[PDB]
Design a protein around this ligand. Structure first.
Ligand SMILES: [Pr+3]
Ligand SMILES: [Pr+3]
Length: 279
């Protein structure tokens, strides 16, 4: 299949070079996979989700996304127009309040929740969790991310927007998960993107168009935006049977565009997520 005049990030992950405008992908489109978006919530009623999104847990007074951040990230995973995996099932877990902030204890609870809840869902092609959040180093937060991964869920996490080594941030610094940095449409590392040896992979993160609350759309920037590109790609590849939750991050790194990025500091991988689609 081919989506013309696609958002640049979608085009980039289906091309060996920057500057293209068409998203090429297999029609299966992540059908049969499930992606948990652990964030401020999802506006499930947005027409772009086509009924494929549902809130399953909240740690606040309402399950509504009063912020927009979670709805944006979910859209990049699997909305019709703005998503990588256009037929995946989306589950929302609200661990962040409507100002976009959250306590580490609540974030940990949300991760443990997903590890259990997945056993109550029909996800024959596998399960992914997308975490576009983070803060200062915490061994407890890292441990929760490791548990989630160990339970059989592909965990993708944002590297952080500090233009610094991700080793001092959590859950970015947990080695066993998939830590995602951000790039822009000219194949430069995004100016805000964290780096370091713990990064696994880069994805599009600057000027990313996606869904927003109130049935709208918005372009915003961050490693928060790069992370769902990689989560969606994992769901897509698991549906095609090319990889599993345990090995998806490594598979994505092995099949990535190599050496295409600029302003990558020595010791950080030069790898950009790529779907290797051949018609
Ligand atoms: Pr290239
Ligand atoms: Pr890793």
């Amino acid at each position: 299949a081919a989506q013309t005049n696609a958002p640049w990030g979608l085009a980039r992950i289906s091309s060996t070079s920057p500057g293209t405008s068409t998203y090429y992908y297999d029609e299966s489109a992540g059908q049969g996979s499930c992606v948990y978006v652990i964030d401020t919530g999802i506006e499930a009623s947005h027409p772009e989700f086509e009924g494929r999104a549902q809130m399953v847990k909240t740690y606040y007074y309402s399950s509504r996304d009063g912020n927009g951040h979670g709805t944006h990230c979910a859209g990049t995973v699997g909305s019709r127009t703005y998503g990588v995996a256009k037929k995946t099932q989306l589950f929302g877990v609200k661990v962040l309040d409507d100002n976009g902030s959250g306590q580490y204890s609540t974030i940990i609870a949300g991760m443990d929740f997903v590890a259990s809840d997945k056993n109550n869902r029909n996800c024959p092609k596998g399960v992914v969790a997308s975490l576009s959040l983070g803060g200062g180093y915490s061994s407890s937060v890292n441990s929760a991310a490791a548990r989630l991964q160990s339970s059989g869920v592909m965990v993708a996490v944002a590297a952080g927007n500090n233009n610094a080594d991700a080793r001092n941030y959590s859950p970015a610094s947990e080695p066993s998960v998939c830590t995602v940095g951000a790039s822009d449409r000219y194949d430069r590392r995004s100016s805000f993107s964290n780096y370091g040896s713990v990064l696994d992979i880069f994805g599009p993160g600057t000027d990313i168009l996606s869904t927003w609350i109130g049935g709208s759309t918005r372009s915003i920037s961050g490693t928060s935006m790069a992370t769902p590109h990689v989560a969606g790609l994992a769901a897509y590849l698991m549906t095609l049977g090319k990889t599993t939750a345990a090995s998806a991050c490594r598979y994505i790194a092995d099949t990535a565009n190599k050496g295409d990025l600029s302003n990558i500091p020595f010791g950080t991988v030069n790898l950009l997520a790529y779907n290797n689609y051949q018609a």
